[PDB]
């Protein structure tokens, strides 16, 4: 018993047959944190217990979100999401704000709890089933079933949208200057206000959300020593690019002339006049690699010409709402990472990087994980969708640690890859 509203019939995408994923191992802490948060929900009957008779399944893990509220269980509904039907509501019903990127500050607000207020289709409830594990497999894992719009499910924001809509109508109305967006269990609020005026209008919003549909957001713990909270805000205007292309040497040797062409010959796909013909001419014979330094000024001229084409508003790019999005990472240096996001290959609509903040959080995975979390966010704020990630790491690996360095309410799609040196220049 929760909402006198009538349950909206949800059917899965034809042919598919609901999630049947297995529950990967969880640490004690996480188990407890998961147990607690879980039972208090059965008490409120947000979810019911269920036995073996329910074959379907999806996994859960909880993350230690650094906020003065509590923990956070996270169902990995990426499976059921693709198994689940479409939603004309999630698309046109939820258009995407141009100016979300254009603002000075955008805050992320976990409007998750605005979900318990709506029951899930009785017929559908078998699919959103998860299962808590147990230390050394004492007693068997207790299984639950969702009875209301579940946290992180392609439907929760669709069905609940016409509501979320009215809830913000007052706020978005008395703050036109502000830009609000909805993506999964999150609200992307952005204003051009002074940061202190923003941090005060979010809390302005972070309270209206209360007197209305008891939408409880998280209470974050701010502190003193190394002020991370001061970083929590997001500034999309402050976002840069990556036209760092241009190489530069005085003693141009064979190796350096070849490396430059290899990299420049491939770039011909990402830029117009990438004419590297006269450069090939300089390395005409079986010249001694390591020493020969043909300084030829002949090339110097059109080498500067190619340099020109490498820093400008690329011709060819375009965002097709239709096609997916892709994001590619590469361990580029010391704690430095870079990313390219594209739809139709070799015509990326945005490139950036990731440099671990000054601090003792050195862990190759941890950076990659965090990195992904960043590339994801940019996509949400910019095009309003989520990139699919080709992760430069071993699947078997990333599976052992990604939970321990992930903080978002959402989890994007990802595969694994080992692409050799060209993908770094």
């Amino acid at each position: 018993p929760i909402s006198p509203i009538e349950t909206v019939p949800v059917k899965l995408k034809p042919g598919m047959d609901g999630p049947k994923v297995k529950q990967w191992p969880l640490t004690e802490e996480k188990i407890k944190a998961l147990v607690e948060i879980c039972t208090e929900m059965e008490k409120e009957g947000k979810i019911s217990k269920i036995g073996p008779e329910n074959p379907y399944n999806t996994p859960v893990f909880a993350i230690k979100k650094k906020d003065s509220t509590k923990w956070r269980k996270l169902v990995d509904f990426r499976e059921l999401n693709k198994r689940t039907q479409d939603f004309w509501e999630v698309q046109l019903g939820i258009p995407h704000p141009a100016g979300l990127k254009k603002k000075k500050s955008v805050t992320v607000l976990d409007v998750g709890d605005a979900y318990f207020s709506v029951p899930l289709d009785e017929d559908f409830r078998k699919y959103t089933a998860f299962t808590i594990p147990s230390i050394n497999n004492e007693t068997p894992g207790i299984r639950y079933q969702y009875n209301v719009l579940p946290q992180g499910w392609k439907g929760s924001p669709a069905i609940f949208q016409s509501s979320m809509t009215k809830i913000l109508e007052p706020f978005k109305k008395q703050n036109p200057d502000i830009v609000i967006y909805q993506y999964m269990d999150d609200l992307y609020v952005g204003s051009d206000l002074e940061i202190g005026q923003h941090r005060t209008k979010i809390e302005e919003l972070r309270q209206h959300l209360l007197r209305w549909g008891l939408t409880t957001p998280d209470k974050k713990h701010q502190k003193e020593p190394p002020f991370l909270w001061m970083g929590y805000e997001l500034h999309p205007d402050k976002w840069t690019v990556q036209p760092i292309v241009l190489p530069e040497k005085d003693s141009w040797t064979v190796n350096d002339i070849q490396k430059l062409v290899g990299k420049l010959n491939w770039a011909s796909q990402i830029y117009p006049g990438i004419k590297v013909r006269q450069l090939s001419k300089l390395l005409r014979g079986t010249k001694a690699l390591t020493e020969v330094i043909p300084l030829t000024e002949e090339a110097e001229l059109e080498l500067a010409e190619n340099r020109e084409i490498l820093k400008e508003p690329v011709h060819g790019v375009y965002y097709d709402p239709s096609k997916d999005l892709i994001a590619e990472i590469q361990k580029q240096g010391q704690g430095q990472w870079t990313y390219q996001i594209y739809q139709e290959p070799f015509k990326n609509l945005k490139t950036g990087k990731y440099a671990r903040m000054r601090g003792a959080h050195t862990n190759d995975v941890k950076q990659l994980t965090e990195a992904v979390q960043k590339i994801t966010t940019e996509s949400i704020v910019i095009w309003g969708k989520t990139p699919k990630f080709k992760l430069p790491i071993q699947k078997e690996t990333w599976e052992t640690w990604w939970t321990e360095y992930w903080q978002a309410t959402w989890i994007p799609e990802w595969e694994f890859v080992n692409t050799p040196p060209l993908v770094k220049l």
Partner: antibody, heavy 123, light 108 residues
Framework: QITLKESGPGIVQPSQPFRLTCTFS??????????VTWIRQPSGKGLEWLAT???????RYNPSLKSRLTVSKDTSNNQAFLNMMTVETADTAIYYC???????????????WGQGTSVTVSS | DIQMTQTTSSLSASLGDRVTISCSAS??????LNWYQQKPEGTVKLLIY???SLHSGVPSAFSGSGSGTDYSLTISNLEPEDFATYYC?????????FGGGTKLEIKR
């Protein structure tokens, strides 16, 4: 612009409590990053940190004195108080109220002070 | 209670001289340090935050320096105003502590 002046009893008998009030202007004890601190420089010595009153109501006291001292503020009136009970000799000194504020990820210092008030303790 | 120590208590100088004051911490303070100046009159202005960043208004001659349990404040060419007491402060552990300042007197 930004300013904060401290006001106290000037003179307080031993074993009696006192309460210095710091009024301020320019900034606000309502804005995220801000705050105010009470420093204490005893007559011919270095300044000492006593307590910082934080905007988020999470004030911090010096371990040596919380058992006798407290902080609070009425942001509405732009005042910041500092209460210390059962006062002793040693405590008699100039007390400073100071506007502190977390600027960003790593910046945190007492941005602007004020001309301390003289609390003298004696029979 | 990170203990803060300003080894040099009162240093001697002259208009033009180069002053550097040393400040040591009980434990690492990850550059969480501020420099406070106090005129003979008795007013305290903020000199620099992050043991390196210049406060506004403060002149360029002033400069932070340090890493870890040690840091230093350096005045390029001394001036009249600049002859005052200096307070070293750390904000790593919350019990905010200032290390008993350093007196900068005029040599005679």
């Amino acid at each position: 612009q930004i300013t904060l002046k401290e006001s106290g009893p000037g003179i307080v008998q031993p074993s009696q409590p006192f309460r210095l009030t710091c009024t301020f202007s320019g900034f606000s004890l309502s804005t995220s990053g801000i705050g105010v601190t009470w420093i204490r420089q005893p007559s011919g010595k270095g300044l000492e940190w006593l307590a910082t009153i934080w905007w988020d109501d999470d004030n911090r006291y010096n371990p040596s004195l919380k058992s006798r001292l407290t902080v609070s503020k009425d942001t509405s009136n732009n005042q910041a108080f500092l209460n210390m009970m059962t006062v002793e000799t040693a405590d008699t000194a100039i007390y400073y109220c100071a506007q502190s504020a977390i600027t960003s990820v790593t910046d945190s210092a007492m941005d602007h002070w004020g001309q301390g008030t003289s609390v003298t303790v004696s029979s | 209670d990170i203990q803060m120590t300003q080894t040099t208590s009162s240093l001697s100088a002259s208009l033009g001289d180069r002053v550097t004051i040393s400040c040591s911490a009980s434990q690492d303070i990850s550059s969480y340090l501020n420099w406070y100046q106090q005129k003979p009159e008795g007013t305290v202005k903020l000199l620099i935050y992050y043991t390196s960043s210049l406060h506004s208004g403060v002149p360029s001659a002033f400069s932070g320096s340090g890493s870890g349990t040690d840091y230093s404040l350096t005045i390029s060419n001394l001036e009249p105003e600049d002859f005052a007491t200096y307070y070293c402060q750390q904000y790593s552990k919350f019990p905010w502590t200032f290390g008993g300042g350093t007196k900068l007197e005029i040599k005679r």
